[PDB]
């Protein structure tokens, strides 16, 4: 792809997301989603192969169906109240349609199936984009209409997402599918607190994006897409594997790391309500994500796997292009828990 | 929907074990039917008759579990003259677990289902008595 | 609510189910997507015509424009799938199973 | 209940949707969607939206011509299926037909809720406006306001169209 | 009302013409007469086999160029607005981008058929 | 949710004019020192990733890291303090304007209240 | 004396298509090293036309 | 020794060092001035000094 065309497509994706965020009109939000999808499809197919075509097709079909449902919900809301402004969503049937449309755009269970397949079929850069930037617009829309959101449906989908992400991640050897399942579980954690406090949702979003950016940038630095290809990295880049292990621990949620803070705040916010059982189940289920993170850490940093002879030639060459902000993302992804009260600048 | 659960809950705890068992088996049948729908959607059976066989198997197992649970819990509540107690629900849950183990023809599944279903039913009864909310309304 | 509204909403639901159910050819699914656009256009136009909102008369035009954008996107993807496999069968799109 | 014309047109709309919803080959699915586009054009003509109905008919005619070309190129088989040549297609077709008839019967006979809320029928002529005003047409003025009021819509739409051309180029590039 | 009568009359006249054409003459159809027409011999394959489309890229662009017509047809009415300077800016903007999209596909060899 | 919509609020200000009536955080604030420590750690990780002497490779870029983190942290702390001050102001005003919902109860002494005694044995 | 470190037999249990191999997924194969599946040599079928004699 | 001379110079890249140190100094001076202005403004509003 031409660099100019690639830059234009990336800016069109970003402009669609910004249009979703800055619009007070339902039609303009729909147009932002459609522009985002239109520019997003080629980026997944930047490196051409049958798997990339499959991922692009599946992503397009899922997002197009979601756009259908979103427009239908908008039209029903217009029919029952001649309002075009993104607000309380005066009709409950339209609200259910909108909730399922946005959940299927996000990948929340039971609509989670598309995410592992699309993440595995594309490169690591497109996977980074898909799992970080493509979550902002649906979550922004969900935040704007959280007053009319139904707790029973949203909490059911969030708990389902946490359970399914934890379970599906256990079976995975490929790194992209592991990241997709962890993304699903984090999405569930984000949307569980949505009807109670959207500031906690935004905080979890920012922490998850920081950790995900760090992890994808580490996986791009060490060109590893499977468990055993990452098992070789210690023989060339031990510091990278150590940083990856600390980032994985942070992803798991163990204190005093940055990852612990979002769950800690969500649990506190839910227990400010009555809501005792559900946070308990959420933590006991996040234990599964911690387990397969630890499996990755065992394979990559805490043990030394056998290497090959040709690594001696790689020993003589440096990493050509260094991605900026990798150091910053690692630090923000690990050592930020003492700055927890600064979340008050988010509401 | 939840009208099944209202028809189950509108019956007093220690009265009319037949009606309570009917409501419980209706709930079980609905759950098994939903499970069958998802299983057929995700794992096709390669033929229509094998699919209806799987649907009937799952639905019958769930309905039997629910019926046994409701009947045993109601009978235990009324013979012991002790309603508002989670022990009746525990006994019903273990009876349902034994039913599941017999349906799957396995002693280990039967014992595990006894323990876990009894614990779950006891917790549900405790939540009914105390007022625990699975899906709390936002209040703050 | 009138009865024509029932008919339009039933048309939308039928097209959504038709899209959800997949037979073999991808082309038929794109047909169902375009039918869903058609139903949404008709519903929007009827509501917009009935209550005299003058400024929303343009949004069905924009809806059709972005419908065409989706149609072109789907056709390009179908071209590439057929080039890879020689048929537009969805059964072939199973590489990401493993 | 006055000549039932809007009712008949909407019923044919649903019938065409059932026809192409069945997925009994692209050539016949295109025919069904063309019929649906025509009857929808008529439906919105009956409400005063002549420009919108004609334009959607034109757009869908062009789209269905492109789809016919693509069906003969890449979505064809030895024996294309019609609505009676396969048990699944025929079953879906008759199921859609009977569902439409059932909801029509349970709507005309009783005012019982189907999904959103129960309706009345009574003929869609009752809900009209008695509007006696204007030497212009409201719909044409509203659509023409896309250039005076809808600058933002024009900008986003034109950008989307240019980007879509670039996108189809990149996707079908190949390599 | 009158357009319905006109359409019904035209369709009925055409249908009666077909009916006359099929029921007036003497039909004698046998298997050889109704066989598919190749010039002299029997076809090798089927007419239902895939037929490659060398202008597939122009066909997709036709969909996007067709919807640029839906945006320009209300222009005769838009010329009657009071603020003509913002209308003329928007109408020319909508055609420059249409011209630039045609130029882009032209320069990138998108208008050439597949060889 | 709770603070998203409030009267007289500029959308993207990040620091309203009424925030200047609050004491600014001291430059030796422990949170600012922690932000500077985060900048130093980022600089060290930058040195280690690029295969450079971790402690001594780039002093100018490490200084830039530290000062950038401190600079962002100062305004972050200002906004944090402003939002907490708004929370307390609103809560106090709401308590004052709704006396019947926050009534001062009668003061009882431990000689009058009867607490049940549970022996340990 | 020296600490135990994983060998080939240990490392090959993380080299399959999935963890926990089963009966259904035993015949799955891991994706290609570069995510490029071999091109399916699809037989091209041109249209054969009788041009003439009539 | 190096076969090729490692494009990152054997001397410091004085341009990058220059603007890096310059932006660090500018940021520190701006922060000091902002802090002083905030202190004076706060004392002015609250009637302290
Ligand atoms: C008050 C309510 C009461 C409780 C309700 C809540 C609890 C529900 C319990 C259901 C547990 C879920 C799983 C069941 C077992 C696994 C499935 C299976 O194969 O079973 C075969 C298994 C033995 O057969 P097998 O051949 O050895 O197993 C085959 C292989 O092992 C392997 O088999 P397989 O590979 O073919 O697996 C099947 C297949 C298919 O997977 C499934 O089966 C899906 C099942 C999930 C459905 C959940 C049911 C909950 C319904 C709630 C509402 C009820 C309405 C009333 O799996 C998959 O392909 C992937 C699964 C995961 C992917 C995502 C699926 C999740 C979908 C979303 C969940 C529900 C969404 C609801 C709405 C969402 C909108 C936000 O057990 C059975 O025989 C079936 C019976 C199951 C027991 C049901 C117990 C009912 C008790 C009711 C008592 C009521 C008393 C009175 C109350 C007061
Ligand atoms: C506004 C929002 C709302 C929007 C949504 C609104 C939707 C409603 C409007 C829809 C109108 C329909 C118009 C067109 C639809 C398009 C159909 C289509 O394209 O077909 C493609 C699709 C693909 O076929 P194909 O690839 O060309 O042929 C290859 C073979 O099909 C496959 O190859 P094979 O033979 O090797 O495979 C083995 C065999 C295997 O065959 C089987 O295994 C099926 C046997 C299942 C037994 C059913 C349970 C029996 C007992 C239940 C009793 C109920 C309660 C009674 C008391 C309890 C009793 C104990 O075939 C299958 O795998 C088929 C399984 C899928 C069945 C159909 C899926 C529908 C939903 C899932 C139902 C699952 C049933 C479980 C129970 C559900 C709860 C009752 O065709 C089919 O799947 C076959 C059936 C299609 C004909 C009927 C379609 C109508 C269904 C519409 C929705 C259902 C009703 C909704 C009403 C809601 C109230 C208003
Ligand atoms: C924290 C500190 C440490 C704690 C941890 C350690 C302790 C706890 C863990 C250890 C024990 C728990 C293990 C659970 C059971 C495991 C079964 C299993 O794994 O299945 C796979 C395993 C093999 O799998 P498979 O291929 O499906 O079966 C092929 C067989 O190998 C082929 O077998 P077969 O063909 O030769 O014959 C099979 C058949 C024929 O049976 C036999 O072959 C032999 C008979 C075995 C059981 C029948 C009872 C006869 C002896 C009992 C006499 C009185 C005992 C003392 C009680 C009064 C105290 C004064 O079995 C039956 O029909 C028996 C039905 C069950 C009736 C027993 C009812 C006992 C309820 C408890 C009442 C007392 C509670 C204590 C209250 C005390 C208050 C002061 O199944 C078995 O072989 C075991 C079946 C027999 C069940 C034994 C369980 C009774 C022990 C008490 C359990 C209560 C503890 C937990 C409470 C909650 C449980 C509901
Ligand atoms: C709570 C209180 C404070 C605690 C805060 C947290 C800890 C401190 C901050 C952490 C971040 C800071 C540094 C991070 C980047 C450094 C990376 C590194 O490798 O360092 C190498 C570097 C030595 O390398 P070199 O000299 O360039 O040449 C040797 C080659 O480079 C040799 O290169 P190589 O290729 O041969 O290296 C291979 C090696 C290299 O692998 C590593 O070195 C591991 C890298 C550390 C991961 C850091 C991730 C982010 C930090 C998270 C910390 C988590 C804390 C929470 C608790 C959970 C613990 C995980 O990998 C392995 O051999 C595999 C071993 C697998 C073990 C798995 C465990 C690793 C994770 C443990 C992290 C725990 C914190 C460690 C902090 C210090 C570590 C250097 O270490 C240093 O010299 C820096 C140490 C600190 C300098 C401070 C000195 C300033 C002046 C002193 C005076 C103080 C004030 C004076 C005023 C008083 C008035 C008079
Ligand atoms: C501020 C920083 C912006 C940075 C981001 C730039 C990205 C967007 C591009 C520029 C922003 C577009 C804003 C335009 C909003 C339209 C409304 C405003 O501009 O007024 C209009 C002014 O009209 C002008 O024509 C505005 C458009 C001029 C710009 C031409 C389009 C070029 C934009 C670049 C992006 C397009 C993509 C393709 C590149 C060529 C109408 O004024 P008026 O008619 O009195 O009042 C109408 C109301 N009535 C009916 C009551 C009278
Ligand atoms: C690991 C931590 C991740 C942090 C993520 C990146 C850190 C740097 C953030 C970049 C700073 C620039 C962003 C904005 C600066 C100027 C723009 C200004 O207008 O923003 C206003 C206010 O600024 C931002 O809103 C707040 C950004 C502050 C981010 C830091 C908080 C991190 C959470 C706590 C973790 C501790 C981090 C410690 C430092 C590393 C917006 O006000 P408003 O229009 O009304 O908000 C609308 C949306 N709401 C109401 C729903 C919130
Ligand atoms: C609370 C709900 C109570 C659920 C209790 C049931 C759990 C029983 C599990 C104990 C293990 C029993 C056992 O022997 O497993 C058999 C049994 C089926 O035979 P297999 O072992 O898989 O066959 C292997 C060889 N072909 O295992 C299972 O399928 C069940 C395992 C998971 C049960 C479902 C757990 C779901 C919990 C959350 C639901 C929401
Ligand atoms: C729109 C432009 C054209 C207008 C359309 C209609 C034109 C009307 C012209 C009428 C001319 C009369 C048509 C007569 C020819 C009909 C076909 C014909 O020739 O069949 C001959 C056939 C041979 O039969 P056999 O000898 O028994 O068996 C031999 C096979 N073993 O003989 C017949 O059956 C002829 C029967 C009389 C036909 C009736 C004609 C009456 C006029 C009808 C005009 C309709 C216009 C409306």
UniProtKB/Swiss-Prot annotation, chain A:
Chief place of localization: mitochondrion
Enzyme Commission numbers on file: 7.1.1.2
Keywords: Electron transport, Membrane, Mitochondrion, Mitochondrion inner membrane, NAD, Respiratory chain, Translocase, Transmembrane, Transmembrane helix, Transport, Ubiquinone
Organism: Sus scrofa (Pig)
GO cellular component terms listed in the entry, alphabetical order: mitochondrial inner membrane; respiratory chain complex I
Compartments in which it is found: Mitochondrion inner membrane
Enzyme class, broadest EC rank: translocase
GO terms classed as biological process: mitochondrial electron transport, NADH to ubiquinone; mitochondrial respiratory chain complex I assembly; reactive oxygen species metabolic process
Keyword NAD applies: yes
InterPro entries (alphabetical): Complex_I_Subunit_2 (IPR050175), NADH_DH_su2_C (IPR010933), NADH_UbQ_OxRdtase_chain2 (IPR003917), ND/Mrp_TM (IPR001750)
Pfam families: NADH_dehy_S2_C (PF06444), Proton_antipo_M (PF00361)
GO MF, one annotated term: NADH dehydrogenase (ubiquinone) activity
Similarity section: Belongs to the complex I subunit 2 family.
Keyword Nucleotide-binding found: no
Protein known as: NADH-ubiquinone oxidoreductase chain 2
Primary role: Core subunit of the mitochondrial membrane respiratory chain NADH dehydrogenase (Complex I) which catalyzes electron transfer from NADH through the respiratory chain, using ubiquinone as an electron acceptor. Essential for the catalytic activity and assembly of complex I.
Catalyzed reaction equations: a ubiquinone + NADH + 5 H(+)(in) = a ubiquinol + NAD(+) + 4 H(+)(out)
Quaternary structure annotation from Swiss-Prot or TrEMBL: Core subunit of respiratory chain NADH dehydrogenase (Complex I) which is composed of 45 different subunits. Interacts with TMEM242.
Topological category with respect to the lipid bilayer: Multi-pass membrane protein
UniProtKB/Swiss-Prot annotation, chain C:
Free-text function comment from the UniProt entry: Core subunit of the mitochondrial membrane respiratory chain NADH dehydrogenase (Complex I) which catalyzes electron transfer from NADH through the respiratory chain, using ubiquinone as an electron acceptor. Part of the enzyme membrane arm which is embedded in the lipid bilayer and involved in proton translocation.
Keywords: Electron transport, Membrane, Mitochondrion, Mitochondrion inner membrane, NAD, Respiratory chain, Translocase, Transmembrane, Transmembrane helix, Transport, Ubiquinone
Species assigned in the record: Sus scrofa
Enzyme Commission no: 7.1.1.2
Root EC class: translocase
Name of the protein described by the UniProt record: NADH-ubiquinone oxidoreductase chain 4L
Reactions mediated catalytically: a ubiquinone + NADH + 5 H(+)(in) = a ubiquinol + NAD(+) + 4 H(+)(out)
Superkingdom of source: Eukaryota
Compartment(s) of residence: Mitochondrion inner membrane
Principal subcellular localisation of the protein: mitochondrion
GO terms classed as biological process: ATP synthesis coupled electron transport
GO cellular component: mitochondrial inner membrane; respiratory chain complex I
Annotated membrane topology: Multi-pass membrane protein
MF annotations from Gene Ontology: NADH dehydrogenase (ubiquinone) activity
Segments passing through the bilayer: 1-21, 29-49, 61-81
Record flagged with keyword Mitochondrion: yes
Family: Belongs to the complex I subunit 4L family.
Oligomeric form and interacting partners: Core subunit of respiratory chain NADH dehydrogenase (Complex I) which is composed of 45 different subunits.
Pfam families referenced in this protein's UniProt entry, alphabetically: Oxidored_q2 (PF00420)
Keyword NAD attributed: yes
UniProtKB/Swiss-Prot annotation, chain D:
Organism per entry: Sus scrofa (Pig)
Protein name, entry field: NADH-ubiquinone oxidoreductase chain 6
Biological role stated in the UniProt entry: Core subunit of the mitochondrial membrane respiratory chain NADH dehydrogenase (Complex I) which catalyzes electron transfer from NADH through the respiratory chain, using ubiquinone as an electron acceptor. Essential for the catalytic activity and assembly of complex I.
Family: Belongs to the complex I subunit 6 family.
Keyword Zinc (UniProt): no
Keywords, sorted A to Z: Electron transport, Membrane, Mitochondrion, Mitochondrion inner membrane, NAD, Respiratory chain, Translocase, Transmembrane, Transmembrane helix, Transport, Ubiquinone
Reactions the enzyme catalyzes: a ubiquinone + NADH + 5 H(+)(in) = a ubiquinol + NAD(+) + 4 H(+)(out)
GO cellular component: mitochondrial inner membrane; mitochondrion; respiratory chain complex I
A GO term for molecular function: NADH dehydrogenase (ubiquinone) activity
Domain of life assignment: Eukaryota
UniProtKB/Swiss-Prot annotation, chain E:
Gene Ontology BP annotations: mitochondrial electron transport, NADH to ubiquinone
GO terms under cellular component: mitochondrial inner membrane; respiratory chain complex I
TM annotation in the entry: 3-23, 55-75, 86-106
Pfam family, any one: Oxidored_q4
InterPro entries, per the entry: NADH_UbQ/plastoQ_OxRdtase_su3, NDAH_ubi_oxred_su3_sf
Compartments where located: Mitochondrion inner membrane
Catalytic activities: a ubiquinone + NADH + 5 H(+)(in) = a ubiquinol + NAD(+) + 4 H(+)(out)
Molecular function GO terms recorded: NADH dehydrogenase (ubiquinone) activity
Keyword match ATP-binding: no
Described purpose of this protein according to its UniProt entry: Core subunit of the mitochondrial membrane respiratory chain NADH dehydrogenase (Complex I) which catalyzes electron transfer from NADH through the respiratory chain, using ubiquinone as an electron acceptor. Essential for the catalytic activity of complex I.
Protein name, as recorded: NADH-ubiquinone oxidoreductase chain 3
Originating organism: Sus scrofa (Pig)
Taxon lineage: Eukaryota, Metazoa, Chordata, Craniata, Vertebrata
């Amino acid at each position: 792809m031409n660099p100019i065309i690639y830059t234009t497509l990336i800016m069109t994706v970003m402009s669609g997301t910004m249009l979703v965020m800055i619009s007070s009109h339902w039609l303009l939000i729909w147009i932002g989603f459609e522009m985002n999808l239109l520019a997003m499809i080629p980026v997944l197919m930047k490196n051409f192969n049958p798997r990339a075509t499959e991922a692009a097709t599946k992503y397009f079909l899922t997002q197009a169906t979601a756009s259908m449902m979103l427009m239908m919900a908008i039209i029903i809301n217009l029919l029952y109240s001649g309002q075009w402004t993104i607000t309380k969503m005066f009709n409950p049937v339209a609200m259910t349609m909108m909730t399922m449309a946005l959940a299927m755009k996000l990948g929340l269970s039971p609509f989670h199936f598309w995410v592992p397949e699309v993440t595995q079929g594309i490169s690591l850069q497109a996977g980074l984009l898909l799992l970080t930037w493509q979550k902002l617009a649906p979550l922004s829309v969900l935040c704007q209409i959280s007053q009319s959101i139904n707790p029973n449906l949203m909490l059911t989908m969030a708990m389902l997402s946490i359970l399914i992400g934890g379970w599906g991640g256990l079976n995975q050897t490929q790194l992209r599918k592991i990241m997709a399942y962890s993304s699903i579980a984090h999405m569930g954690w984000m949307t569980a607190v949505l009807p109670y406090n959207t500031t906690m949702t935004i905080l979890n979003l920012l922490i998850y994006i920081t950790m995900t950016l760090a992890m994808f940038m580490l996986l791009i630095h060490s060109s590893a897409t499977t468990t055993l290809s990452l098992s070789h990295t210690w023989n060339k880049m031990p510091v990278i594997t150590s940083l990856m292990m600390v980032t994985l621990l942070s992803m798991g949620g163990l204190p005093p790391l940055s990852g612990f803070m979002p769950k800690w705040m969500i649990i506190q916010e839910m227990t400010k309500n009555e809501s005792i059982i559900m946070p308990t189940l959420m933590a006991m289920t996040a234990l599964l994500n911690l387990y397969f993170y630890m499996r990755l850490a065992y394979s990559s940093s805490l043990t030394m796997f056998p290497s090959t002879n040709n690594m001696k030639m790689k020993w003589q060459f440096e990493h050509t292009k260094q991605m900026k902000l990798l150091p910053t993302m690692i630090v923000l992804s690990t050592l930020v828990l003492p700055m927890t009260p600064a979340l008050s600048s988010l509401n | 929907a939840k009208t099944l659960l209202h028809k189950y809950s509108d019956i007093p705890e220690g009265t009319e074990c037949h009606r309570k068992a009917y409501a419980s088996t209706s709930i079980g049948g609905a759950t098994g039917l939903i499970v069958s729908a998802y299983s057929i959607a995700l794992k096709p059976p390669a033929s229509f008759l094998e699919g209806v066989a799987r649907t009937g198997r799952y639905t019958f197992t769930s309905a039997a579990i629910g019926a046994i649970f409701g009947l045993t819990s109601c009978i235990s509540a009324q013979v012991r003259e002790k309603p508002d107690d989670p022990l009746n629900y525990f006994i019903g849950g273990c009876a349902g677990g034994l039913t599941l183990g017999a349906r799957t023809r396995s002693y280990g599944i039967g014992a595990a289902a006894c323990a876990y279903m009894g614990l779950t039913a006891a917790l549900v009864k405790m939540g009914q008595l105390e007022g625990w909310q699975v899906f709390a309304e936002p209040k703050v | 609510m009138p009865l024509v509204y029932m008919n339009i909403i039933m048309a939308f639901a039928i097209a959504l189910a038709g899209l959800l159910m997949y037979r073999s050819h991808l082309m038929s699914s794109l047909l169902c997507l375009e039918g869903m656009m058609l139903s949404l256009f008709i519903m929007s136009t009827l509501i917009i015509l009935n209550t005299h909102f003058t400024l929303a008369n343009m949004m069905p035009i924009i809806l059709l424009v972005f419908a065409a954008c989706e149609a072109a996107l789907g056709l390009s993807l179908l071209v590439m799938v057929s080039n890879t496999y020689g048929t537009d069968y969805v059964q072939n799109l199973n590489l990401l199973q493993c | 209940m006055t000549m039932y014309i809007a009712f008949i047109l909407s019923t044919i709309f649903v019938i065409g949707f059932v026809g192409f919803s069945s997925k009994p080959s692209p050539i016949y699915g295109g025919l069904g969607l063309i019929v649906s586009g025509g009857v929808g054009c008529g439906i919105v003509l009956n409400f005063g939206g002549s420009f919108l109905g004609l334009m959607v008919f034109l757009i869908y005619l062009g789209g269905m011509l492109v789809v016919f070309g693509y069906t003969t190129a890449m979505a064809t088989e030895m024996y294309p299926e019609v609505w009676v040549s396969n048990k699944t297609v025929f079953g879906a077709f008759v199921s859609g037909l009977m569902m439409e008839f059932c909801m029509v019967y349970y709507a005309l006979k009783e005012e019982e809720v189907e999904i959103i809320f129960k309706f009345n029928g009574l003929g869609d002529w009752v809900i009209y406006d008695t509007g006696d005003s204007g030497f212009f047409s409201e719909e044409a003025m509203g659509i023409a306001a896309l250039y005076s009021y809808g600058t933002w819509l024009v900008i986003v739409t034109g950008w989307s169209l240019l980007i879509g051309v670039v996108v189809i180029m990149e996707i079908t590039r190949g390599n | 009302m009158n357009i319905m009568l006109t359409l019904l009359t035209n369709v009925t006249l055409a249908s009666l013409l077909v009916l006359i054409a099929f029921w007036l003459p003497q039909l004698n159809a046998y298997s050889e007469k109704t066989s598919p027409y190749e010039c002299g011999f029997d076809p090798m394959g089927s007419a239902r086999l895939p037929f490659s489309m060398k202008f597939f890229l122009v066909a997709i662009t036709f969909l996007l160029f067709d919807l640029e017509i839906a945006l320009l047809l209300p222009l005769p009415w838009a010329s009657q607005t009071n603020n003509l300077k913002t209308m003329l800016t928007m109408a020319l903007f909508l055609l420059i981008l249409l011209a630039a999209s045609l130029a882009y596909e032209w320069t990138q060899k998108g208008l050439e058929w597949a060889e | 949710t709770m603070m998203s919509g409030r009267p007289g609020r500029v959308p993207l200000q990040f620091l309203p004019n009424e925030a200047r009536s609050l004491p600014p955080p001291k430059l030796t604030d422990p949170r600012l020192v922690y932000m500077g420590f985060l900048g130093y750690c980022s600089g060290l990780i930058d040195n280690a990733i690029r295969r450079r002497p971790v402690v001594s490779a780039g002093l100018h870029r490490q200084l830039l890291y530290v000062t950038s983190f401190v600079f962002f942290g100062y305004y972050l702390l200002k906004r944090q303090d402003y939002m907490y001050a708004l929370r307390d102001h609103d809560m106090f005003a709401y308590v004052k304007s709704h006396p019947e919902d926050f009534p001062e109860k009668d003061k009882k002494t431990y000689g009058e209240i009867l607490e049940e005694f549970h022996p340990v044995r | 004396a020296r600490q135990w470190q994983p060998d080939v037999e240990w490392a090959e249990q993380f080299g399959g298509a999935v963890m926990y191999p089963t009966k259904e997924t035993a015949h799955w194969k891991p994706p290609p090293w570069n995510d490029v599946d071999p091109p399916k040599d699809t037989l091209v079928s041109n249209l054969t036309l009788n041009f003439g004699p009539q | 020794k190096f076969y090729i001379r490692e494009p990152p110079h054997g001397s410091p890249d004085w341009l990058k060092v220059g603007l890096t140190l310059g932006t660090s100094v500018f940021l520190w001076i701006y922060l000091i001035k902002q802090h002083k202005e905030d202190v004076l403004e706060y004392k002015r509003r609250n009637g302290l000094e």
